[PDB]
Structures are given as C-alpha cells and as structure tokens.
Amino acid sequence: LHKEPATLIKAIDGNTEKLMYKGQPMTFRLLLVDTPEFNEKYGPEASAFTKKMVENAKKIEVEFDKGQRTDKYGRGLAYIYADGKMVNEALVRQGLAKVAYVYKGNNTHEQLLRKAEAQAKKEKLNIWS
Ligand SMILES: Cc1cn([C@H]2C[C@H](OP(=O)(O)O)[C@@H](COP(=O)(O)O)O2)c(=O)[nH]c1=O
Numbered sequence: 001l002h003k004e005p006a007t008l009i010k011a012i013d014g015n016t017e018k019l020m021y022k023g024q025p026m027t028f029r030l031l032l033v034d035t036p037e038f039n040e041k042y043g044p045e046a047s048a049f050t051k052k053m054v055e056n057a058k059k060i061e062v063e064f065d066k067g068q069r070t071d072k073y074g075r076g077l078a079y080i081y082a083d084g085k086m087v088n089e090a091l092v093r094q095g096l097a098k099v100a101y102v103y104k105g106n107n108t109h110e111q112l113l114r115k116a117e118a119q120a121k122k123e124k125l126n127i128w129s
Contacts, residue, residue, distance in 0.1 A: 001108055003061040003081060008054050013038060014046030014091055017054060017080065021062055029075040030088045031065055032113050034100035042127050046096040050087060057082035067106035079109060092116040095125030 009018040009025055014035025017028050035046035054060060063079040071077055080087040088109065091097035093116035102110050121128040 001063050001065065001079075003063045006060045006062045008057075008060055011047070011051035011054055014043070014050045014097060016075065017050070019060060019062065019076075019080075021076065026076045027074070028062065028078055028080060029071055029073075030091070030097075031077050031079055031106060032099055032102055032110060033088050033091055033097040035091060035097040036127070042096060045126065046091060049091065049094060049096050053082045053085075053087055053090060054080070059083055065106040065108050067103065077106065089113055089116050093120055095120035095123070095128045098127065 006019040006021045009020055011017055019028055036043040061081040092113050099113045099117050
C-alpha cells in the first residue's frame with residue numbers, strides 16, 4: 001500500500017472526514033472501524049478525538065487498500081494518517097472504535113487493528129470500560 005497526500009477540509013466525526021484528495025473534495029469513510037454515533041455513548045468523545053488528531057496534524061495522508069476505493073454512498077474508503085499516525089488504529093487503540101466492516105480484499109491492516117482492540121479491551125478503555 002501507498003500513502004498519498006490530502007488536506008483536511010472539515011472534520012465530521014469518528015467514522016468520516018471531508019478531505020481534499022487529488023484536488024477534489026471527498027468524504028472519507030475510515031476502513032475497518034466503527035465508532036459510536038454522536039447520540040451514542042462515547043460518540044462525542046470519538047468525534048472530538050478524531051477532530052483533534054486531524055486538525056492538529058501538519059500532514060494528512062490517505063492510504064487505499066487493494067479493493068474497492070469508494071463505497072455505495074460515494075465515500076472514499078481508506079486508512080487516514082495524521083503526521084504518520086493512523087487515525088483508524090488510534091481510535092481502536094483508545095477504545096473509541098471497534099474493528100468492524102472487515103471485507104475480503106480491503107483488509108490489509110485487520111490484524112494490526114485487532115491487536116489495538118485487544119490492548120484497549122485489556123486496559124478497559126472507554127467503550128471497553
Ligand atoms: C466501512 C465500510 C462501510 N460500508 C458501508 C456498509 C454500511 O452499509 P449500510 O449504510 O447499508 O449500513 C455502511 C455503514 O457505514 P457507517 O458506519 O458510516 O453508517 O457503510 C462499506 O460498504 N464498506 C466499508 O468498508
């Protein structure tokens with residue numbers, strides 16, 4: 001896989017961000033994760049954590065997996081990095097998301113994220129408390 005450049009347009013929530021990619025605005029849906037919705041327990045905390053991570057970053061990058069690059073809503077499906085740190089992995093590692101939506105052929109970082117989830121659960125963090 002390869003990291004490519006993008007710039008933040010707007011933080012949305014834990015699950016999605018508006019980024020400029022190849023010069024066009026897109027909504028990105030993070031691969032392999034599901035955060036609680038804003039109304040749900042830890043939803044506001046997941047959005048805040050994401051917002052801070054991507055707004056404070058000097059450099060945003062997107063990393064497509066091997067499979068489909070857009071979902072049925074036209075959302076880009078990627079791993080997002082903020083100053084080299086994966087936002088997908090970070091949410092999971094903090095117990096602010098669960099590993100989810102693992103489809104065959106777009107699952108390169110599945111085991112990395114499942115290890116993060118094991119650690120968050122062992123530490124009883126947030127959703128795992
Ligand atoms: C994360 C992801 C979601 N989706 C679609 C599946 C779900 O369909 P449905 O909308 O029919 O439930 C939807 C959930 O995304 P959200 O968690 O953002 O609501 O996103 C994909 O198709 N591929 C993906 O990799």
